[PDB]
Design an enzyme around this catalytic site. Structure first.
Site, mmCIF file in Angstrom:
data_model
loop_
_atom_site.group_PDB
_atom_site.id
_atom_site.type_symbol
_atom_site.label_atom_id
_atom_site.label_comp_id
_atom_site.label_asym_id
_atom_site.label_seq_id
_atom_site.Cartn_x
_atom_site.Cartn_y
_atom_site.Cartn_z
ATOM 1 N N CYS A 18 0.815 -1.210 0.000
ATOM 2 C CA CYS A 18 0.000 0.000 0.000
ATOM 3 C C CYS A 18 0.852 1.264 0.000
ATOM 4 O O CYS A 18 0.460 2.275 -0.599
ATOM 5 C CB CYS A 18 -0.941 -0.008 1.203
ATOM 6 S SG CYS A 18 -0.101 -0.025 2.803
ATOM 7 N N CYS B 14 24.054 40.612 20.899
ATOM 8 C CA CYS B 14 24.835 41.204 19.824
ATOM 9 C C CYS B 14 23.993 41.244 18.559
ATOM 10 O O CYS B 14 23.116 40.393 18.367
ATOM 11 C CB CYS B 14 26.134 40.422 19.567
ATOM 12 S SG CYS B 14 25.904 38.744 18.941
ATOM 13 N N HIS C 108 24.741 40.443 15.585
ATOM 14 C CA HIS C 108 25.138 39.497 14.552
ATOM 15 C C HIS C 108 23.981 38.567 14.203
ATOM 16 O O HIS C 108 23.275 38.067 15.082
ATOM 17 C CB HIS C 108 26.348 38.683 15.010
ATOM 18 C CG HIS C 108 27.643 39.430 14.926
ATOM 19 N ND1 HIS C 108 28.274 39.952 16.035
ATOM 20 C CD2 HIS C 108 28.426 39.740 13.867
ATOM 21 C CE1 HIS C 108 29.389 40.553 15.661
ATOM 22 N NE2 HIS C 108 29.506 40.438 14.351
ATOM 23 N N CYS D 200 28.907 32.321 18.899
ATOM 24 C CA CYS D 200 29.093 33.114 17.691
ATOM 25 C C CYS D 200 30.541 33.005 17.228
ATOM 26 O O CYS D 200 31.468 33.242 18.010
ATOM 27 C CB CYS D 200 28.714 34.570 17.947
ATOM 28 S SG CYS D 200 29.038 35.683 16.560
ATOM 29 N N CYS E 209 32.017 36.793 17.422
ATOM 30 C CA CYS E 209 32.248 37.321 18.759
ATOM 31 C C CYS E 209 33.051 36.376 19.644
ATOM 32 O O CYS E 209 33.549 36.812 20.688
ATOM 33 C CB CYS E 209 30.913 37.643 19.435
ATOM 34 S SG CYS E 209 30.057 39.080 18.749
ATOM 35 N N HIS F 269 -2.042 -0.176 7.007
ATOM 36 C CA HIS F 269 -2.479 -0.061 5.623
ATOM 37 C C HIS F 269 -2.542 1.410 5.241
ATOM 38 O O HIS F 269 -2.907 2.255 6.062
ATOM 39 C CB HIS F 269 -3.847 -0.723 5.417
ATOM 40 C CG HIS F 269 -4.276 -0.799 3.986
ATOM 41 N ND1 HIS F 269 -5.500 -0.339 3.549
ATOM 42 C CD2 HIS F 269 -3.645 -1.286 2.891
ATOM 43 C CE1 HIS F 269 -5.603 -0.537 2.247
ATOM 44 N NE2 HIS F 269 -4.491 -1.109 1.823
#
Length: 1739
Positions: free
Chosen positions: A958, A1080, A1082, A1124, A1127, A1212
């Site tokens: 199926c 920050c 960023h 980061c 940083c 099924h």
């Protein structure tokens, strides 16, 4: 150094300076360390708490910290202790608090909530000035707060209140809450939010300072709504919520002593309703109001539920008369009625005295013209409660049962029903019928008085209304309602006597048509019908009939509706009364009924329905009148004209035009705006007039002959056959026109006239209608068939046949030219039938010049290869659009072919040749093979037209077929994949992908054009391997893995062939993973390609929440904070996923599966999840987020739902898919495609939405009920969304053969196994039957008959023994008919019989075994056995048949059937009935057959079988039913001489002749065979076998009776076995043995006395015999003793010889006396009758 002191303070100040600069450092780590060391030095604290407090104050340490560090919760946590240290010595100022509160001005939510929880934790130590400063700061923020701002402020206030250790600050908190919740400048949402905050603050903070002010705060709220400035509703719900939790039962009484709520709220309602009514007169141009009145009402309701207070009258007055009785808006009245409905449900709340006061004072005083549905139920309960208290009604079970008649409320309930709208009137009628009809005790003896008084008073009211008419329209409604009261009242009576009651109603109905009122007449007539016939009318009619037998004005009275009623009662008398017919016919019956129809002044002021009813009744009367007078003259031509004009008018739905000049009726027939359809009551008028006309024409035949020449009686039939409607009317008209021309004609001219008339409207009107001709063609066929069968010669037959042939040729040319018929199906079927019936009127020279002629119009050929088998011709061409499409048209073509074949051998020959070369030439050249399946249909299916093509499932496939269905149903995919041409270890993978694409193309083309219901994917399953490993067809797998593999393979195949990745472009998307940091600026962004969308299901309830989770994303903080790369530090970052590119089709996965380590197996989640039909992805996209924050359609529609149902390991899969149409959802499961009703939302919830439900379980044979929580294990798995043939997907960047072949094969096979084909075969074989008879003075078939028989038997043999008998019963259809056809063909011919035997039974060497034993069908085996018996019987007079390996064909057939007994019979138990049944039937035929069977030693071999020892192995099936074997043995042995084994028991006396031989047999066939005697008499095994097993059979007793005659030894063995069976056998099967023993004891030979002595007593000194068994069974198993006693009673009462044995032996008499005494004692403690007869024989 002690002398170094000022330097100590200097270094402390320098350390402070350094720490403060460290705080000023932009690095968070520096600020972290500075905050930590500040916390350290403060805790250790010449440094007191004052100097640090100042140093923080002037240097503003908090100000520097608060500006940035608040974004991290830990920084706030550290600063909390510093703030506490500052506060505890009174160092914090208002400006510092202002800066703290300024932190939320435009900042992020995290910072705001950080400030909020900080303030919540700090509020405990704040000074009163600090706190109320913060409070008016909160108010100032509230002045400008947004929606989220307001709710977060409320959350902050609740945090402050919850942390209040001493309940002093909560006073101002709750004051602020009251100020906010009572300020109208703030919307309603924040209202209820603040109310909930207040309620939860007062509820669960009850530790201290909550109680004893609950009264104070609630009294403050009461005093607040005691003034009217819109404080009322909020304070009301405040008090309602406070009293919900906050002792409560006595609390209401406490607030009832001096501060009553119900009274005060009552004055609130009154003085506010009047206030609104003050401006409602001038400001009415507005809208409702409802919001406040309903709230106050619900407050009263909740308060007055469990306080045990009684609602006093004064407040009830002030809240009933001033609220709704004198109101403005209709909704207020609705609210008040719903109130008085809910208040008094099943329990009073106003005390019975006050209720009986106000309901009679003002509730009944209300005008019923202003009252609604809620008023009905409230008014009902008012009746019930008021009347059941005084002592006038009793509640009983449900219905408040009546005990009085002088009601206090029925006086105006009649006023309600007489003045209302429809629904209110219906409810009042229901009330009156349920209160009046049911009568109980103390009044159950007074039916007559109450019913009569009710009827009389109600009729008097009706008369009072009536006299006003002669304002009109509403009184019609009054009459209709009052008559409805009557009709319902009598309706409940059953589950008249007064003549005036019907006399007034006659005039009432007369006025109904006088001023044209529909419901009046219908109601009056219904009331009349639902009534026994009036006593005065019936006796008056009978007296008049008797008077005139030894009446015009009765049926011609001047009142209109009384004539119709009188006709109804007359028909009631006639139809069951047996005497009244003779009275009616004698006086004026027939003449007046006919003059009823032919006169003009019957009914001058007649309604459209009065004439209809009067006619229909007179017609039903006249039908039976003519039926009675039929057996044995007044009708004339004018009666026929009247009836025909009646039918003219009634078939048009225009019976009012029954006096039309007959041209206008034609005009409205000829398609006049389709506004003349007959009603459901004109149909009976038309039909009944049709029988009347038929019977009248039977009376007078000559009228219809004279009607032919008129222009009328020609348009009449044409109209009623083609231009009429109401198909039943047309069917009746055609049936009775045929009956007229068959019986009433008394000649042949009328038949010719109708035939000629019907044939002149073929191309003129039968084509214009094309839908009503189904009965016109039926008349054509029936009339032509009758003309043929009655030897009537149709004058112009050959020309009509030629015209039909040319028309059929034109139709076939139209089909060939275009592909669609230019006509309807009914026209084609009717024309084919007419051509068939016209074919009978030709000699054998014709019917052959049409079909099979060299120069003729070879209509057989065009039929066969253009109307019925064009697909078979295509298939035959391969192995080197049919005109008749519908099954009725195919049947018509079959009938035409059969009519061509009958009587013409040269046509049957060609038809048979074509059929053989088209179906039975492949294998039936020397032998006939089989399908190997005994109930066979083509297992592919029809593929319904509007449906689609499924896919075969092998059990666990199926998750392929569902995915393929979903992919194919996308139009872009279906167009792109099929358009890729040229598709027919890197290289190995490239070829693998090419094969993937090719197989997908093949399956797509199959689903596009295959005509079968489903397809079975060989190449799909063979090619694909999952992740390289081969796919196991029996192994369950996730559909996601297969989908990913398939899409990747298809993309690779497209790329390798230079095509773009269509699947990636249409389905694939790309996430935009965004990382935004809080500390920050960023930001990081990247793209991630994806194909399916995964959404959480366990923790989400709807698709919107799951999609919003992506926008919200996840927050990384603390030890999990994102690092980061720029940083080089850890900082909080929000990781969210946004969709960058929106695919046209979106695939979304539901993560409903996971893994469980405890169970060590995959598990399935069936949590409730939601997804809408339409999805708006724009808010969840990059563009939406950018627009919201402030720096190609996006809507999607659900089209495909992949659903899983079952366990995680198994399960099924199926699909629910929308089909793209220009003007829906479908169910796609495996090979089945069906329509679905999921468009409703409830079905969406039930099927795919899943979730838990409180299921209901039924068990214990529908006697036990239980409720169990059940999980919907069937639920959606993947959702497909489509946005609102693309050349880009086909543009380069870098077979239709198999479908046609399988379609042609399917059509050929489907035509082979069609039901219509089997009827055609039956017709073809059974046709020419009248030609297959031999000449009367001869006993062999003439040449033409012989050829017909040979050809028919050849084709019948091929068809039946190739595919005929193997077809299942539904299509094959009762193979007894096939046996009858085979008998018709086979007999009267020797060569045909020999050919059939040799070529069908003696060339396969397995025919007898497979058709007598191996066939799992009783009917097929029986038909084959009967066929073999037939052939064997009729081949005895034939010559010696050659041996097929002086023996006739019957001998060979018997030898072949007996050869099955060697090995084949002892393999096929549960199937042996028909074999020995064949042997049974053959013997019964005659003496010669019995002699033939005996000479074969059949009885001996059959006796050996069932005892093993046979010609072969024993029968494996131990439970074999061998009754027919014993029947054969008995019948064959009884035709033998056994006189050798006879003794007469008297020395010298010869034995008596045997009476129990075979009757209808002059003399025994032969002396009994030695091999038979050895098994019967010498040995005792077969006798025991037939006694123990062959029980209840009529042949075993016959055989035993025959053999026991004058045979002491055989009788002794039989008696011993019978006595053993009587003693040692189960009592539930003892009756057959006792009956057989009784029949044995009744053998009146010379050994009867010995047999009775040995049965009653038994073998001496063995304790066996009937008396011995009775003695043993007296104590236990007494049923056996009773049955033995019953058998002996029968023996003594039916055998005179065995009554002198009893009377004459004293010991037997003593034993019988003991037995009867035991039976009497047992029955004292059928049996009673047996005991009564027991001692009527006692001496």
């Amino acid at each position: 150094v002690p002398g170094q002191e000022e330097t100590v303070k200097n270094l402390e100040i320098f350390r402070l300076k350094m720490i403060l600069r460290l705080l000023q450092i932009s690095s968070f780590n520096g600020k972290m360390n500075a905050l930590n060391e500040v916390n350290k030095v403060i805790s250790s604290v010449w440094l007191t708490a004052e100097r640090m407090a100042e140093w923080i104050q002037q240097n503003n340490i908090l100000s520097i910290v608060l500006r940035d560090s608040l974004h991290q919760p830990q920084y706030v946590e550290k600063l909390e202790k510093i703030l506490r240290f500052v506060i505890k010595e009174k160092a914090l100022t208002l400006q510092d608090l202002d800066n703290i509160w300024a932190a939320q001005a435009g900042k992020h939510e995290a910072i705001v909530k950080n400030v909020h929880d900080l303030l919540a934790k700090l509020a405990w130590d704040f000074s009163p000035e600090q706190l109320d400063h913060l409070f008016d700061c909160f108010k100032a923020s509230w002045t400008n707060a947004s929606k989220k701002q307001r709710e977060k402020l409320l959350e902050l206030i609740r945090r402050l209140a919850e942390d209040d250790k001493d309940g002093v600050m909560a006073h101002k908190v709750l004051n602020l809450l009251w100020n906010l919740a009572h300020s109208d400048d703030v919307p309603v949402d924040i209202m209820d939010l603040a109310l909930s905050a207040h309620i939860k603050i007062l509820d669960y903070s009850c530790s201290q300072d909550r109680d004893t002010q609950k009264i104070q705060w609630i009294d403050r709220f009461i005093e607040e709504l005691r003034t009217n400035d819109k404080w009322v509703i909020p304070a009301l719900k405040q008090i309602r919520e406070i009293c919900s939790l906050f002792y409560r039962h006595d609390l209401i009484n406490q607030l009832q002593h001096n501060h009553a709520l119900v009274t005060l709220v009552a004055e609130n309602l009154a003085t506010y309703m009047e206030s609104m009514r003050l401006y409602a007169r001038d400001h009415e141009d507005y809208d409702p109001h409802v919001q406040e009145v309903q709230e106050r009402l619900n407050f009263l309701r909740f308060l007055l539920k469990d306080g045990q207070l009684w609602l006093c009258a004064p407040q009830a007055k002030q809240i009933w008369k001033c609220l709704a009785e004198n109101a403005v808006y209709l909704c207020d009245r609705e609210a008040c009625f719903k109130w008085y409905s809910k208040l008094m449900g099943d329990e009073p709340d106003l005390d019975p005295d006050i209720n009986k006061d106000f309901f009679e004072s003002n509730v009944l005083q209300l005008d019923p013209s202003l009252l609604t549905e809620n008023g009905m139920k409230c008014f009902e309960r008012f009746f019930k409660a008021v009347n059941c208290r005084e002592g006038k009604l009793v509640a009983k079970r449900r219905a408040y049962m009546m005990d009085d008649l002088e009601l206090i409320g029925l006086d105006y309930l009649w006023r309600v029903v007489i003045q209302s709208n429809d629904d209110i009137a219906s409810r009042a009628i229901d009330l009156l019928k349920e209160i009046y009809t049911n009568l109980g005790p103390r009044l159950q003896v007074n039916q007559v008085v109450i019913h009569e008084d009710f009827i009389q008073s109600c009729f008097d009211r009706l008369k009072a209304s009536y006299d006003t008419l002669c304002c009109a329209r509403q009184e019609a409604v009054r009459m209709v309602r009052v008559l409805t009261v009557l009709r319902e009242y009598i309706n409940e009576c059953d589950s008249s006597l007064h003549p005036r009651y019907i006399s007034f109603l006659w005039q009432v109905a007369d006025l109904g048509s006088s001023l044209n009122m529909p419901p009046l007449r219908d109601g009056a007539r219904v009331l009349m019908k639902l009534m026994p016939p009036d006593s005065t009318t019936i006796e008056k009619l009978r007296a008049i009939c008797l008077d005139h037998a030894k009446l015009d004005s009765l049926f011609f009275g001047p009142s209109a509706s009384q004539v119709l009623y009188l006709t109804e009662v007359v028909y009631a008398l006639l139809m069951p009364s047996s005497d009244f017919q003779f009275h009616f016919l004698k006086s004026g019956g027939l003449p007046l009924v006919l003059s009823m129809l032919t006169r003009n002044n019957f009914l001058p002021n007649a309604d459209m329905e009065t004439r209809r009813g009067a006619y229909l009744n007179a017609l039903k009367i006249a039908k039976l009148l003519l039926t009675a007078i039929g057996y044995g003259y007044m009708p004339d031509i004018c009666v026929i004209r009247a009836i025909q004009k009646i039918i003219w008018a009634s078939g048009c739905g225009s019976l009012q035009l029954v006096f039309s000049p007959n041209e206008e009726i034609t005009k409205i027939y000829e398609k006049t705006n389709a506004g003349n359809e007959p009603d459901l009551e004109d149909e009976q008028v038309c039909c009944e007039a049709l029988e009347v006309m038929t019977l009248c024409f039977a009376l007078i035949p000559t009228a219809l002959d004279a009607l032919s020449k008129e222009k009328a009686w020609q348009t009449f039939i044409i109209d009623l056959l083609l231009h009429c409607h109401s198909k039943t009317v047309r069917q009746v008209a055609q049936e009775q026109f045929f009956l007229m021309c068959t019986r009433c004609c008394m000649g042949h001219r009328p038949l010719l006239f109708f035939i000629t008339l019907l044939f002149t409207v073929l191309g003129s009107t039968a084509r214009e209608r094309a839908k009503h001709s189904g009965d016109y063609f039926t008349l054509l066929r029936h009339l032509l068939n009758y003309a043929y069968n009655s030897n009537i010669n149709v004058p112009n037959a050959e020309v009509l046949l030629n015209n039909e042939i040319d028309w059929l040729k034109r139709i076939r040319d139209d089909v060939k030219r275009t592909g669609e018929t230019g006509i309807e199906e009914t026209i084609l079927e009717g024309h084919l039938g007419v051509t068939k019936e016209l074919l009978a009127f030709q000699t054998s020279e014709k019917k052959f010049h049409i079909g099979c002629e060299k120069g003729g119009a070879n209509l057989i050929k065009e039929l066969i290869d253009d109307f019925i088998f064009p697909a078979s011709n295509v298939y035959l061409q391969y192995m080197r659009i049919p005109v008749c499409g519908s099954p009725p048209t195919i049947n018509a073509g079959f009938e035409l072919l059969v009519a061509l074949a009958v009587g013409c051998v040269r046509n049957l020959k060609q038809i048979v040749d074509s059929l053989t070369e088209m179906y039975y030439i492949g294998t039936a050249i020397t032998t006939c093979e089989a399908l190997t399946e005994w109930e066979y249909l083509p297992p592919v299916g029809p593929r319904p037209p509007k449906g689609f093509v499924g896919l075969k499932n092998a059990g666990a496939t199926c998750y392929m077929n569902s995915v393929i269905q979903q992919l194919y149903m996308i139009p872009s995919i279906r167009n792109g994949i099929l358009a890729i041409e040229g598709t027919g270890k890197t290289e190995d993978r490239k070829e693998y992908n090419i094969g993937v694409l090719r197989h997908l193309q093949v399956i797509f083309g199959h689903l596009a054009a295959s005509r079968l219901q489903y397809y079975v994917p060989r190449g799909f399953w063979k090619q694909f391997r999952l992740w390289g490993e081969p796919v196991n067809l029996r192994e369950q797998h996730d559909a996601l893995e297969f989908f990913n593999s398939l899409v990747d393979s298809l993309d690779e195949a497209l790329k390798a062939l230079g095509h773009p990745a269509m699947l990636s472009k249409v389905l694939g998307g790309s996430f935009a993973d965004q990382k935004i940091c809080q500390g920050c600026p960023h930001r990081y962004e990247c793209e991630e390609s994806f194909t399916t969308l995964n959404v959480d299901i366990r923790n989400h309830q709807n698709l919107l929440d799951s999609l919003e989770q992506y926008v919200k994303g996840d927050l990384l903080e603390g030890a999990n904070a994102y690092h980061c790369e720029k940083c080089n530090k850890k900082v909080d970052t929000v990781k969210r996923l946004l969709i960058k590119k929106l695919p046209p089709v979106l695939a979304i996965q539901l993560k409903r599966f996971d893994y469980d380590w405890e169970r060590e197996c995959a598990i399935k989640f069936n949590d409730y999840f939601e997804f809408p039909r339409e999805l708006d992805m724009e808010p969840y996209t990059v563009a939406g987020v950018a627009k919201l924050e402030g720096d190609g359609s996006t809507k999607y529609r659900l089209v495909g739902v992949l659903v899983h149902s079952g366990q995680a390991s198994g399960g099924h899969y199926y699909s629910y898919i929308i089909q793209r149409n220009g003007g829906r959802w479908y169910k796609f499961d495996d090979g089945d495609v069906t329509e679905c009703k999921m468009d409703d939302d409830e079905e969406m919830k039930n099927q795919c939405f899943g979730g838990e439900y409180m299921g209901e379980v039924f068990d214990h044979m529908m006697k036990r009920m239980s409720y169990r929580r059940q999980k919907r294990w069937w639920n959606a798995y993947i959702l497909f969304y489509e946005r609102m043939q693309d050349d880009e997907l086909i543009r380069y960047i870098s077979i239709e053969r198999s479908v046609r072949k399988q379609n042609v094969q399917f059509m050929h096979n489907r035509m082979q196994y069609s039901m219509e084909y089997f009827q055609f075969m039956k017709k073809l074989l059974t046709c020419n039957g009248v030609y297959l008879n031999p000449p009367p003075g001869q006993d062999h078939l003439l040449p033409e008959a012989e050829e017909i028989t040979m050809i028919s038997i050849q084709l019948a043999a091929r068809f039946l023994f190739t595919t005929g008998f193997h077809t299942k019963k539904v299509v094959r259809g009762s193979a007894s008919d096939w046996y009858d056809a085979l008998c018709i063909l086979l007999r009267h011919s020797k060569n045909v019989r020999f050919w059939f035997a040799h070529n069908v039974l003696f060339n396969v060497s397995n025919r007898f075994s497979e058709y007598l034993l191996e066939c799992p069908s009783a009917e097929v085996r029986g038909a084959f056995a009967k066929l073999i018996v037939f052939i064997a019987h009729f081949s005895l007079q034939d010559g010696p048949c050659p041996s097929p390996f002086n023996l006739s064909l019957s001998d060979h057939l018997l030898r072949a059937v007996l050869n099955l007994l060697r090995r084949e019979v002892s393999e096929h138990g549960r199937h042996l009935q028909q074999y020995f049944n064949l042997f049974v039937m053959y013997a019964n035929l005659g003496v010669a057959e019995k002699t033939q069977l005996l000479k074969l030693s059949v009885p001996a071999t059959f006796m050996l079988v069932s005892l093993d020892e046979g010609p072969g192995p024993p029968i494996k099936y131990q439970y074999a039913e061998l009754g027919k074997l014993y029947s054969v043995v008995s019948q064959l042995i009884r035709c033998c001489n056994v006189s050798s084994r006879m003794q007469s028991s008297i020395n010298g006396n010869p034995p008596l002749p045997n009476p129990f031989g075979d009757p209808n047999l002059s003399q025994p066939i032969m002396p009994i065979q030695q091999n038979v005697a050895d098994i019967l008499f010498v040995r005792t095994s077969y006798v025991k076998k037939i006694i123990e097993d062959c029980s209840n059979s009529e042949e075993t007793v016959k055989l035993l009776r025959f053999c026991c005659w004058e045979n002491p030894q055989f009788s002794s063995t039989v008696l011993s076995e019978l006595l053993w069976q009587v003693a040692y056998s189960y009592t539930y099967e003892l009756r057959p043995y006792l009956d057989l023993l009784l029949q044995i004891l009744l053998i009146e030979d010379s050994w009867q006395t010995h047999r009775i002595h040995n049965a009653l007593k038994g073998i001496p000194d063995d304790r066996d015999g009937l008396f011995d068994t009775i003695q043993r069974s007296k104590n236990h198993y007494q049923k056996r003793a009773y049955q033995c006693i019953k058998c002996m009673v029968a023996l003594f009462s039916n055998c005179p010889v065995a009554y002198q044995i009893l009377q004459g032996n004293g010991d037997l008499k003593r034993k019988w006396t003991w037995a009867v005494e035991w039976l009497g004692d047992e029955l004292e403690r059928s049996a009673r009758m047996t005991l009564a007869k027991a001692c009527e024989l006692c001496p």
